[PDB]
Amino acid sequence: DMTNMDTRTRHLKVSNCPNNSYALANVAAVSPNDFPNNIYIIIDNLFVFTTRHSNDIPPGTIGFNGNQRTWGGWSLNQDVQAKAFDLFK
């Protein structure tokens, strides 16, 4: 359910994927304190990803796999802006 959510922008760091299973999962691994579970979030108003609760990533940081960095023109430790998403509107 995506009706209510904190849509505030956050500055998050790019990092190596926590492991291969997470890369396969194709879900932005985020700490519980960051954002809810199983919800779509946009980054730079262009790149959409599905959040999933992940205790190995501290709050304030986002994990990415290689393909997503390839798509997004990003290096590691690059600081990016992340916001909530809601495709239906």
Add this chain to the structure above:
Amino acid sequence: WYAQDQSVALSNKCFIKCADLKALDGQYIEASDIYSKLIKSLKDYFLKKGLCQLAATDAVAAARTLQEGQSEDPNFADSRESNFLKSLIDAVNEGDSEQLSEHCKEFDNFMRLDKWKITILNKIKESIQQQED
């Protein structure tokens, strides 16, 4: 115990077995050191020393082992084993795992790789591929 008894040949058999088992057991540095003792079959000892060094992501020590054998022992300098070792070091420095495989097939074609060399060479290849990934 043989080395105390001045039985060099037996002691060398013993340290060959010890070094091979150590290298297969992941103790590459210690096996390389035992191969140094064995050096101090010689061509084979040089090869194996370099190989353990390559399994320890130690390309520079492999280069020095190659140089040592080439300068100090003329039979090793011109041997197929020295050529194989230089080619492997070159591949490792290049991060080129298929080139390593190609060199392995060539050397297998002219000098059959025993099971020990195959295991260590596979470990070296895996370390290259891991750096690539």
Add this chain to the structure above:
Amino acid sequence: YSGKQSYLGSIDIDISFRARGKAVSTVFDQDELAKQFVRCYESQIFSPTQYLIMEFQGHFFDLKIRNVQAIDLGDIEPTSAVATGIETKGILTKQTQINFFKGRDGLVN
């Protein structure tokens, strides 16, 4: 050590794909690489012919300083020749004239 020639006036770096089977032919912008290189290695002493590993766009590169030009803080016009020896040294700054060239691979364009 250097007395006055303690800053980098111009620094040339040869950039290669560490993984040359993964090579990309597109034109690379020297400035983006310059930004990230300075960001990663600001306030560090550099000498020519220095092998380094640097991440860019998911593509890892070996960066080899070709030559270092050492100047003092205050030379409006760079009068120190572009030196290639290890002896010359300088601390990386944003104002350094950074030039990038064909790596050890020769594949980068």
